[PDB]
Amino acid sequence: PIETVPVKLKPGMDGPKVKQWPLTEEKIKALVEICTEMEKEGKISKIGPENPYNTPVFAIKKKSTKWRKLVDFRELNKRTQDFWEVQLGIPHPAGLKKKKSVTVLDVGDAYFSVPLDEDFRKYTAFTIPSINNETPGIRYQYNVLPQGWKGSPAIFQSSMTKILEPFKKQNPDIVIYQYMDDLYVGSDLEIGQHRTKIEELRQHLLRWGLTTPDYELHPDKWTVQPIVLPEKDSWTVNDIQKLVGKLNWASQIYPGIKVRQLSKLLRGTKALTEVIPLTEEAELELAENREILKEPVHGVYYDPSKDLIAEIQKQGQGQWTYQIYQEPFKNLKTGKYARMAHTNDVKQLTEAVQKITTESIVIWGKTPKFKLPIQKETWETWWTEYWQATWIPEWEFVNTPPLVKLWYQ
Amino acid sequence: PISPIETVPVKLKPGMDGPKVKQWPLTEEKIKALVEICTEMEKEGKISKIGPENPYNTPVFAIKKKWRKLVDFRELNKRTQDFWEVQLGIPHPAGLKKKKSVTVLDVGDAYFSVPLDEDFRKYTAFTIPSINNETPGIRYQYNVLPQGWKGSPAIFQSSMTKILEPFAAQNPDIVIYQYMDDLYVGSDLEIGQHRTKIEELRQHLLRWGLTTPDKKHQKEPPFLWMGYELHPDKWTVQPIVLPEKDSWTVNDIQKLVGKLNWASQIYPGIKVRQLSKLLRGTKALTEVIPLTEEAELELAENREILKEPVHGVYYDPSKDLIAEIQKQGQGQWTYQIYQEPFKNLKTGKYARMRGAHTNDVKQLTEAVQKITTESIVIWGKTPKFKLPIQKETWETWWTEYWQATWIPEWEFVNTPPLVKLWYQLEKEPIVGAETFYVDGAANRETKLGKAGYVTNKGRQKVVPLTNTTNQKTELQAIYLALQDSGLEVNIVTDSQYALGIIQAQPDKSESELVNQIIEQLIKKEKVYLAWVPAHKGIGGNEQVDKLV
Numbered sequence: 011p012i013e014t015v016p017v018k019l020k021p022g023m024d025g026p027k028v029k030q031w032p033l034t035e036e037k038i039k040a041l042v043e044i045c046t047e048m049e050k051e052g053k054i055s056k057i058g059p060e061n062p063y064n065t066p067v068f069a070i071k072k073k074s075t076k077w078r079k080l081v082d083f084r085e086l087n088k089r090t091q092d093f094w095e096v097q098l099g100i101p102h103p104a105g106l107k108k109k110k111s112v113t114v115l116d117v118g119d120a121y122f123s124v125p126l127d128e129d130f131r132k133y134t135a136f137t138i139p140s141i142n143n144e145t146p147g148i149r150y151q152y153n154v155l156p157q158g159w160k161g162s163p164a165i166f167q168s169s170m171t172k173i174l175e176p177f178k179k180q181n182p183d184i185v186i187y188q189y190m191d192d193l194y195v196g197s198d199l200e201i202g203q204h205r206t207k208i209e210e211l212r213q214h215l216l217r218w219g220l221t222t223p224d225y226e227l228h229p230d231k232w233t234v235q236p237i238v239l240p241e242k243d244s245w246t247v248n249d250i251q252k253l254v255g256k257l258n259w260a261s262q263i264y265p266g267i268k269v270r271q272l273s274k275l276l277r278g279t280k281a282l283t284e285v286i287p288l289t290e291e292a293e294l295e296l297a298e299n300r301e302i303l304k305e306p307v308h309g310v311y312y313d314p315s316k317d318l319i320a321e322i323q324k325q326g327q328g329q330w331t332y333q334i335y336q337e338p339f340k341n342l343k344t345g346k347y348a349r350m351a352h353t354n355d356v357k358q359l360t361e362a363v364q365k366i367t368t369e370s371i372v373i374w375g376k377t378p379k380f381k382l383p384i385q386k387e388t389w390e391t392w393w394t395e396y397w398q399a400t401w402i403p404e405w406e407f408v409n410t411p412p413l414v415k416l417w418y419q
Numbered sequence: 420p421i422s423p424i425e426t427v428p429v430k431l432k433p434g435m436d437g438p439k440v441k442q443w444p445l446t447e448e449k450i451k452a453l454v455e456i457c458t459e460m461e462k463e464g465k466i467s468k469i470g471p472e473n474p475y476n477t478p479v480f481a482i483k484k485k486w487r488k489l490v491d492f493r494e495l496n497k498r499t500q501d502f503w504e505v506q507l508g509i510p511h512p513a514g515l516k517k518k519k520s521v522t523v524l525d526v527g528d529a530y531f532s533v534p535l536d537e538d539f540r541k542y543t544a545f546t547i548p549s550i551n552n553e554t555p556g557i558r559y560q561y562n563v564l565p566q567g568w569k570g571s572p573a574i575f576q577s578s579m580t581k582i583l584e585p586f587a588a589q590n591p592d593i594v595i596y597q598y599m600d601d602l603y604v605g606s607d608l609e610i611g612q613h614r615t616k617i618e619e620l621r622q623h624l625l626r627w628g629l630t631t632p633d634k635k636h637q638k639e640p641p642f643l644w645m646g647y648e649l650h651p652d653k654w655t656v657q658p659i660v661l662p663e664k665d666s667w668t669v670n671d672i673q674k675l676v677g678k679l680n681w682a683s684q685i686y687p688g689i690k691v692r693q694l695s696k697l698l699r700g701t702k703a704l705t706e707v708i709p710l711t712e713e714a715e716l717e718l719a720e721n722r723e724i725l726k727e728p729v730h731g732v733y734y735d736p737s738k739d740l741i742a743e744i745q746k747q748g749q750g751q752w753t754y755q756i757y758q759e760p761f762k763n764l765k766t767g768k769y770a771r772m773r774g775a776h777t778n779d780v781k782q783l784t785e786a787v788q789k790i791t792t793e794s795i796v797i798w799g800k801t802p803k804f805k806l807p808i809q810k811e812t813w814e815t816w817w818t819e820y821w822q823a824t825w826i827p828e829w830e831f832v833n834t835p836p837l838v839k840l841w842y843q844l845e846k847e848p849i850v851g852a853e854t855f856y857v858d859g860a861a862n863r864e865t866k867l868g869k870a871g872y873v874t875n876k877g878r879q880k881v882v883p884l885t886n887t888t889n890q891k892t893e894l895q896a897i898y899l900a901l902q903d904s905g906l907e908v909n910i911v912t913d914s915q916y917a918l919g920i921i922q923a924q925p926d927k928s929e930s931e932l933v934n935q936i937i938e939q940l941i942k943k944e945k946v947y948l949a950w951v952p953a954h955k956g957i958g959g960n961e962q963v964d965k966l967v
């Protein structure tokens with residue numbers, strides 16, 4: 011709380027200038043309440059028009075009648091990557107996925123002590139908007155490490171790693187990863203004592219001055235979920251077709267596949283609804299390719315130079331299925347998601363995205379860029395309503411339908 | 420005049436420096452008229468003579484139509500830092516809050532009334548010529564926000580904002596909206612105290628240097644503001660004059676589509692689909708364009724709508740917000756926003772198809788989006804929606820649609836026309852219905868093709884096609900199997916294109932072919948459509964891919 015680490019943008023990069031989304035009068039009001047207080051506690055200050063930069067700003071409800079502010083530093087983050095990835099990069103423990111339990115702790119109130127480089131604050135500017143453009147927004151910049159910027163944890167990393175040194179000494183079977191404003195704590199304890207070892211930590215942290223929120227992921231379940239060829243009692247031509255098609259598509263992922271014997275087992279222009287039966291030479295390709303679906307793929311290795319790409323697909327019945335990858339047909343991870351007259355499609359998507367993003371952080375220490383199946387403007391309107399996370403992935407909007415659907419179910 | 424307001428610091432863009440554009444000599448009459456203004460601007464402190472030490476210079480010219488002074492800051496604007504963008508958007512009258520009375524105050528010399536940073540005054544240096552004569556010019560600098568400088572609108576607005584903060588605290592029963600050089604004061608006081616408050620404010624302003632007009636010179640309703648007539652209990656667009664012409668150029672159709680769009684906020688029913696299609700070519704502005712038949716009609720119907728005048732009403736927070744959507748037929752929708760059943764807040768249209776194939780359920784959904792975004796911008800909330808669609812029509816569609824959507828709280832309305840799913844493909848195949856195995860192919864280079872089928876009942880056909888494409892035939896193939904089929908039919912296709920197009924269940928399309936497939940699909944009472952890999956000898960497509 012005295013020395014301000016210097017921050018440089020990557021040379022020939024000006025700061026962010028991103029349009030503020032318009033907000034419901036409800037949500038504005040909260041941000042005024044919240045900022046008026048932040049400004050008294052000195053964490054932010056009003057700014058003049060000699061500051062052109064701006065970063066968007068939302069209001070979410072955390073877990074909680076209490077409104078919280080969420081700032082979208084995606085742009086600034088891109089333009090500071092030199093600083094929070096190379097200069098003071100926090101390295102990623104590639105084992106947290108192994109542990110049988112992982113708890114996530116919000117530590118981002120840590121940062122509001124640390125003052126922010128005097129010269130860098132201009133780039134944190136945000137705007138509280140007004141309605142109908144009655145008057146120009148209220149303009150602040152940050153005086154302290156702001157939650158949501160990737161520099162913030164990168165700076166604090168020393169103070170964090172010191173404070174953590176006692177606890178890592180006492181119990182060195184535990185792993186602790188810091189992604190932005192979250193500590194991911196994994197352990198192989200049975201659940202009962204994991205949850206107390208998490209209380210320990212909590213109160214360890216809390217008595218060195220780090221308050222924390224007063225959510226257990228078992229990566230012992232994560233695995234590429236394989237393609238399922240529904241065997242039934244009956245069979246038809248149609249089903250032989252649906253069957254043939256699935257398998258032909260799969261040939262791009264598992265070249266080791268064949269169906270000629272399938273494709274000859276209906277060689278006659280027949281009605282679709284013909285209950286055709288099972289053959290020997292044909293049946294030889296069902297089981298023979300049915301277990302190849304149990305065998306994993308070959309040569310699928312996470313390139314850390316490349317972005318992760320997540321695709322989700324609505325599957326009906328509150329079901330959603332996702333695949334993460336970097337090169338087509340080379341799927342690193344794949345999963346499914348489901349809700350429990352309480353849920354709506356968006357809420358579901360928003361939850362799914364959150365879930366896929368955490369998995370992502372645990373595994374690779376980087377978030378994926380989402381191909382969201384929704385209409386840009388609908389998302390840009392309702393995503394903050396079920397958003398609980400302190401961070402925000404990149405996303406885009408697939409307006410091209412899938413057709414595959416079940417193919418990935 | 421120059422004020423005791425605090426200055427904003429200003430910098431030039433990094434690794435740049437001040438302009439040095441020399442000045443073309445002007446008429447000895449002009450050079451006269453420049454000095455008359457300069458010194459009377461100097462007396463008033465706005466500018467200060469300087470020694471040639473200052474190396475900077477910016478062109479000056481002069482003009483009239485009382486002579487006037489213009490400066491070419493363009494060169495300076497290029498090297499000055501960027502500032503916080505000013506209000507790009509303007510408040511929509513429909514969302515202005517209803518107030519007992521409304522005062523409009525324009526400030527004068529607004530920019531000249533505000534001081535400019537001292538260390539950034541040098542770069543504003545100009546010079547007045549001495550009718551050549553090898554006579555040294557008059558070197559002057561600004562000490563206030565220069566006109567047409569990049570920094571002026573933003574710094575002025577800061578300054579105005581801050582100058583108001585005290586008053587606004589001591590009088591929060593009143594509301595001041597800010598716009599460029601104006602101030603729009605609205606109150607719910609009695610006419611005698613408001614006039615008092617106004618005249619009070621005017622004095623606060625004057626003590627900070629900002630001049631403002633008398634009760635005698637205050638603009639009086641109705642107010643011609645940003646292409647709107649603002650009345651004290653009603654707003655509308657200004658008068659609109661669509662021209663009648665014999666020939667229509669691109670520039671003309673644009674200005675027309677503009678005006679028509681402008682009108683759409685308060686004049687219901689306005690359509691612009693067919694008119695805007697003309698512009699599709701997006702070619703030269705002076706190119707003449709023939710009017711289509713449908714376009715001529717649309718302009719006619721529009722003309723009738725603007726034949727009489729209609730007005731919008733202001734916003735009341737203590738009243739609910741409502742939105743109603745009415746279909747119009749050509750992928751054209753229209754809506755009205757109201758709190759009370761005959762007094763509309765505003766109106767508009769949604770017509771974007773967003774693709775060459777759509778269905779009304781989708782489109783209506785997209786329409787609600789548009790309305791929600793605007794509602795939120797204008798009134799900071801979203802409206803209760805009154806929609807011509809059955810809760811059962813919608814749930815069916817979205818449950819079965821591949822994208823995700825959010826249908827805000829909404830109640831039915833019966834006002835026909837109503838939104839419907841005209842057909843629905845079967846989810847499972849049909850036992851005891853003929854199975855057609857359609858395929859169709861075309862040679863790119865020959866630009867000729869053929870669609871056909873084959874059935875389980877041994878029925879076969881091939882129609883020949885000229886001037887088409889693979890895609891065009893893939894659909895004709897289906898079009899055929901519908902034509903030659905009973906009221907229940909199984910079609911089996913190798914083209915994901917054609918499948919894609921149909922699975923979407925469009926009810927309206929740019930392609931006539933698809934509109935006709937839509938026709939046939941409506942008659943049939945059961946259609947099942949099924950995909951199989953082409954050139955994979957699935958059994959039956961093989962036979963139909965062979966007759967091609």
Ligand SMILES: CCC(=O)n1c(=O)n(CCOc2cc(Cl)ccc2Oc2cc(Cl)cc(C#N)c2)c2ccccc21
Binds near residue numbers: 652
């Ligand atoms: C019973 C109603 C009544 O007397 N008037 C009324 O309600 N309006 C609409 C509300 O307008 C304003 C509200 C506020 Cl808080 C502030 C200013 C307003 O006016 C503006 C706004 C704008 Cl952006 C530009 C201009 C110009 N030029 C004026 C009226 C508008 C005019 C006259 C009377 C009323």
Ligand SMILES: [Mg+2]
Binds near residue numbers: 599601645
């Ligand atoms: Mg004006």
Ligand SMILES: [Mg+2]
Binds near residue numbers: 749750782928
């Ligand atoms: Mg349509």
